[PDB]
């Protein structure tokens, strides 16, 4: 089918600024509009990254679009967890170099409990001492974690890609079991962490869909397009989360 992990390390998008205006009042509307502005800019980076992701080009365009639309919140939240871990040892939420949340901003954003949920994932990165190689493979698995209930246009091509990235994660933990002791132990800690993202992302999307439909919260064109397509699919039960270990 295929060093694909060395490709993943080299194609990871560069950090982007939020464009946070600290002279404007820190109302929830201003903070959430800033997060949406940042999410839109990051989504352009995600599409460019996915285009050069080994294997992704094999999937038909309709399936590439479906996967990006269903996984956007997972990809962005997992990368937020990574930056928080790398840059602050998971003490703060590192949205961008110019936007680092403390308790004050978590309250001001009107997303305090969701920010605490996010902080709990970054704390798991510290507990596991997650490596960049592990992070990059796991982020590809998140792009491949949510599909239509009735499947994709090219379901077998998708399954081949996801199976091969799972094999890469198993090989990575076989070469490096890290602080978990044995290779199998590491593997199940990583798959348990990947599965835990579905519940956090479901909660993040519920609030995002609420502000999108009831809105001074501004959304960039990139998010208006993704959310307008995704929202009816998620709410009608068409988005099937793939779990390694069923609840």
């Amino acid at each position: 089918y295929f060093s694909p992990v060395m490709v993943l390390e080299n194609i990871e998008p560069e950090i982007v600024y939020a464009g946070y205006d600290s002279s404007k009042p820190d109302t929830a509307e201003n903070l959430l509009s800033t997060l949406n502005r940042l999410a839109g800019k990051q989504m352009i980076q995600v599409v460019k990254w996915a285009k050069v992701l080994p294997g992704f080009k094999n999937l038909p365009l309709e399936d590439q679009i479906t996967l990006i639309q269903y996984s956007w919140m997972s990809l962005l939240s997992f990368a937020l967890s990574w930056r928080s871990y790398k840059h602050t040892n998971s003490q703060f939420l590192y949205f961008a170099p110019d936007l680092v949340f403390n308790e004050e901003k978590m309250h001001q954003s009107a997303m305090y409990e969701l920010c605490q949920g996010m902080h709990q994932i970054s704390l798991q990165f510290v507990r596991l001492q997650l490596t960049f190689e592990e992070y990059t493979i796991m982020k590809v698995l998140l792009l491949l974690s949510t599909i239509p209930k009735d499947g994709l246009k090219s379901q077998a091509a998708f399954e081949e890609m996801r199976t091969n990235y799972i094999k890469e994660l198993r090989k990575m933990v076989t070469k490096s079991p890290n602080n978990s002791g044995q290779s199998w132990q590491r593997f199940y800690q990583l798959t348990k962490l990947l599965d835990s993202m579905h519940d956090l992302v479901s909660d993040l999307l519920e609030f995002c869909f609420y502000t999108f439909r009831e809105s001074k919260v501004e959304f960039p064109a990139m998010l208006v397009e993704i959310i307008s397509d995704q929202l009816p699919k998620v709410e009608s039960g068409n988005a099937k989360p793939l779990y390694f270990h069923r609840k």
């Binding site: 352009i44 599409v47 460019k48 996915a50 590439q64 397009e225 993704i226």
Partner: peptide
Amino acid sequence: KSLLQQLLTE
């Protein structure tokens, strides 16, 4: 043609 379609096909 959507923004995603534009970006993925360019």
